[PDB]
Write a protein that binds this ligand. Structure first.
Ligand SMILES: [Cu+2]
Ligand SMILES: [Cu+2]
Lengths: 633, 633
């Protein structure tokens, strides 16, 4: 029972039992989230040390956290499940609101088509019997001080005849708002369908131009394909022992977590340390339609919902090609039970093309190796969206963070003959507003050991017309050291390169500190004005790379409670501490910015758009580490 | 013979034979390059139309060009090979120098180690029995007005033991220069191995620290791997008819060419036109070591040598995984004969991960398709480098240009205890100078037809604090039209997106012209100072996107004759024509900039570094075109 292990049924239920026992009276605890805390890092580095060198393993208590409500009051407790005691069980200040949970959303979704005010609104549409109404409950977002947990219910039409009909293809022009925990009606909002902010009372609905994606409904003739099969007749080249993966020189743990999907720990390659913990830390999805209620669409999908909570089961359709191993996730329900989320993480090899090749032109004798890869993947369904998260390792020591966005666009109503400059029309009566997906990747590096420095290098021209450079072609690198928490500015035109180095371990060939470098393209950051709540709640989304000093339980880039937050309680605080991070424990938070101008081809379901960040050794080894890979032949 | 067909042996030899017959006297023609010209585009479009609709085919002659020398005089001729006559046969002006040819390089390489004057330098090294001298002859480059074709011979040491010993791991400090066609020794250059530009006479060589890549020599323990196999039990899903490929809705011609490796023509997807001609057009590799003779290392690998001339045989191999079809290239030798280069192009299908997924959270019914990809590939070996060029097509209408650079670094001598700020040390006595690979891709677009406009869209904030945008979150696109030949500036911070649109064909859903968009990251451009020959010779490498008006035989970014060129005779002239290119025949030249700071891991042979540009349908279709793809199931 390893300290990194994901939460068990017994730990999750013990945690809720203890809260139930501690809560007196008739309003019972309403559970929101429960998961296992990481072991304290200083302690766990000693545990792993002992585990690698066969010495006796130190005690590390298993700890969990719980978010729960008692009536309208929100609570966060810390529980020691090794010894069965609550350590802290604290009511949170006014305005701190927990994540959404499936059971509460289901309740509100039911209500949004059942409530008499909403039935009466629906009646004004004068729907024929072949058309039904569907609701997507959304988190409220923030445009004001608001301490109540509110649900903004987006309303749509679907075909009554088929349960997979594409409601996103026909948005309505009203949206009711409920208070989540009491189930009380709050107000009915009206949505503009025209070129500006004008709304009207609910009119009879004239036409039903659905744009269906499902094969039974889309009327598209299927163009056949011949099979392409992948086999591993002798089995896979990776081992899983508990949660410990071994493959081609790599050793690391892969742990499912309810908030991140999975996290990867204690990453070593060829026996050397590389990265202590790697995860998707947050993702904010701000929309750019300036009009109400749309301006409030800024989910924080990890913080408001959780990538593990929302993970698909990968085993029964075949998302992963080859010989696959799987892991499960668990979540609490509102009752405090452990709900299994089966097969959310898949692990498998695949072929990544060529790894290297060279032929001597004099002899035509080649050396060549294929780029075998090991993939860790999870896919989250977040209402309309699909996000596929992959971490891919290869035999040259590279770690590749690879995301594909797919699923369905979040859609707005559109009246006849209207266009808008902040959205693309994607169906005869449906518009998809422009948005961004701003992801933060948390990389706690341990490059060749636990004292690291973050740096960035620029590539710059040499002074022209000198004795040294008389032909005006020379160019050189210069390095800047990150001394304190903060961000680094992007600079694509000096080929700026972020690296984490170990100043204490010198490469004996290049004579510079060993390093890993980050590979990522320059990207547009937060488009919302600085004077906006979107800016205040998500500082990470405003710069490409952030550095903090490590702290236990500082994991989520916009802070622990994002749902309807008023301000950033993650990097917006942490990256401002005035402390030393040189030759220490800097933690890197890389922002992957994706501005999404939807196109028609993204509808009714969208082809994958891929985004990637790579961590690659840079003077970490004393020669290409892939000389150990068999020849391709 | 279809007009797009690659040259045949008969046509190549008819070309050289006509020139031999026309050349009188005892100085015989010395052949440098022969290939078949594209059919003139106007006629070819009519021809394709007739071929399509069963009308009589217009008459279009097969034509070739030939570069050759008579003594020291350089000539270019055009030949009609359908009827067998010379059209033009023209002595080129003083200073125009042809590409290198393998037979002439072999000759100068032999001479670099046998000429008495270089034998004398070698003797000064006092080499022991177990070491041998190796030469890589290089094109001269340009740092002065120079009319003679010169070869700079880079000199190295290798183990005498083994023909695959890595001579790049031990560079010498002298370099002989020879006049290519006369074989006259011109001069002996000396190379600095220290921190600055100081050089000495040739000294005895003290030690032999080779860094070996070959498995016989590298001493590496091989880490085993289990098999991973790809099968297509019913055969592939693509058909090849002549040079015409059909796969999953696409139809286009793949033609091998001596200069570009291959070119792809007449690209249609779902019956609609996309791109008329797609090709890697040039690649310049400028080095950033300011010192002589290094400052002159600036290859134009297509213009100076040719990607087809230099292509690997891929069937050997097997570089391409699965069920493969191959095509050949041919090149002339100095005698005018046709030399076959078997299997330089491989064509095959592969799995590219998931193409789309969506699960309705209510029912948990998924739609999912896998991303089947069709790959066209060639791999050229240019002296030390390998360049893997792929064009990948997918079922959603995307064309991905994907390049991988691998092979061996070009290396410079390095004395003990030296470092340099313009190069990385990659072995005990060998340094890899900084350099750039600047690629230009020529995309002659035919988006839904032959009248196109080039445009770029920017994503910008709405004005804050208005009635329309009261919460400061809104953002919109604005469009700029390219009206005249020239370049577009990069703007990654406004998410700038280059597109080619057809202003005559409006998407009936979005109400905007149909388009293809270019995906590519912002990159650093040419690092050589504006005041350098690198700059005057390669204007394309200074800006990321160029637009010209189409002309027949205007194919190569830096001009037809690059070797020891004084100036750019490509885009540096053509993108400065004052003419209109809106709703006409714009041609797009996309510069893929890769600044290469070598790492120790790139030596003795480098892991692939991948770079891409994608062409993606934007409002081209009225919905996702991949709804015709079968469920993955
Ligand atoms: Cu999106
Ligand atoms: Cu390079």
């Amino acid at each position: 029972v390893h300290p990194y292990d994901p939460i068990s049924d017994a730990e999750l239920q013990l945690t809720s039992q203890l809260i139930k026992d501690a809560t007196k009276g008739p309003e019972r605890p309403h559970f929101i989230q429960i998961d296992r805390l990481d072991p304290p890092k200083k302690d766990m580095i000693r545990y792993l040390e002992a585990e690698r060198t066969g010495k006796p393993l130190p005690h590390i208590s298993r700890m969990t956290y719980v978010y729960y409500y008692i009536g309208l009051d929100f609570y966060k407790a810390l529980v020691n499940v090794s010894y069965g005691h609550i350590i802290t069980n604290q009511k949170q200040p006014k305005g701190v609101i927990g994540p959404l949970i499936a059971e509460d959303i289901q309740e509100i979704e039911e209500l949004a088509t059942t409530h008499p005010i909403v039935k009466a609104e629906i009646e004004k549409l004068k729907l024929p019997p072949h058309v039904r109404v569907v609701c997507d409950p959304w988190m409220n977002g923030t445009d004001s001080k608001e301490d109540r947990m509110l649900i903004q219910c987006y309303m749509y039409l679907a075909s009554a005849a088929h349960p997979e009909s594409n409601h996103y293809s026909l948005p309505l022009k009203f949206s009711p708002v409920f208070e989540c925990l009491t189930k009380k009606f709050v107000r009915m909002d009206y949505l503009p369908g025209g070129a500006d902010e004008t709304v009207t009372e609910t009119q009879a609905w004239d036409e039903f131009p659905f744009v269906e994606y499902h094969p039974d409904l889309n009327g598209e003739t299927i163009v056949p394909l011949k099979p392409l099969i992948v086999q591993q007749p002798e089995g896979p080249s990776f081992n899983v022992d508990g949660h410990k993966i071994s493959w081609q020189g790599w050793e690391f743990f892969v742990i499912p977590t309810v908030r991140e999907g999975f996290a990867i720990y204690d990453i070593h390659f060829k026996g050397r340390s590389v990265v202590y913990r790697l995860s998707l830390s947050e993702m904010t999805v701000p929309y750019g339609d300036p009009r109400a209620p749309f301006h409030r669409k800024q989910a924080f999908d990890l913080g408001d919902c959780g990538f593990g909570a929302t993970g698909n089961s990968l085993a029964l359709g075949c998302d992963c090609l080859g010989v696959i191993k799987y892991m499960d996730c668990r979540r609490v329900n509102t009752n405090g039970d452990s709900v299994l989320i089966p097969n959310t993480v898949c692990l498998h090899e695949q072929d990544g093309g060529l790894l290297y090749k060279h032929t001597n032109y004099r002899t035509n004798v080649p050396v060549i190796a294929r780029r075998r890869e090991f993939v860790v993947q999870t896919i989250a369904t977040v209402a309309n969206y699909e996000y596929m998260l992959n971490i891919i390792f290869d035999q040259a020591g590279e770690i590749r963070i690879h995301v594909r966005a797919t699923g369905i666009l979040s859609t707005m109503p559109l009246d006849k003959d209207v266009t808008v400059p902040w959205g693309t029309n994607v169906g005869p009566r449906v518009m998809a507003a422009y948005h961004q997906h701003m992801l933060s990747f948390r990389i706690d590096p341990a490059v060749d050991g636990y004292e690291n420095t973050v740096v960035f290098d620029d590539v710059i021209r040499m002074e022209k017309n000198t004795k040294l450079n008389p032909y005006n072609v020379g160019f050189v690198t210069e390095r800047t050291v990150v001394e304190k928490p903060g961000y680094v500015e992007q600079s694509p035109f000096t080929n700026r390169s972020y690296k984490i180095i170990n100043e204490n371990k010198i490469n004996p060939i290049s004579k510079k500190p060993v390093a890993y470098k980050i590979m990522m393209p320059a990207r547009q950051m937060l488009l919302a004005d600085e004077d906006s709540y979107n800016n205040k709640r998500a500082q990470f989304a405003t710069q490409q790379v952030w550095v903090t000093k490590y702290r236990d339980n500082e994991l989520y880039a916009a802070g622990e409670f994002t749902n309807q937050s008023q301000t950033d309680t993650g990097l917006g605080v942490w990256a401002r501490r005035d402390e030393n991070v040189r030759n220490d424990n800097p933690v890197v938070w890389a922002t992957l910015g994706f501005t999404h101008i939807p196109r028609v081809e993204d509808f009714p379901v969208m082809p994958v758009e891929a985004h990637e960040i790579a961590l690659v050794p840079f003077g970490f080894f004393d020669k290409n580490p892939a000389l150990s890979v068999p020849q391709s032949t």
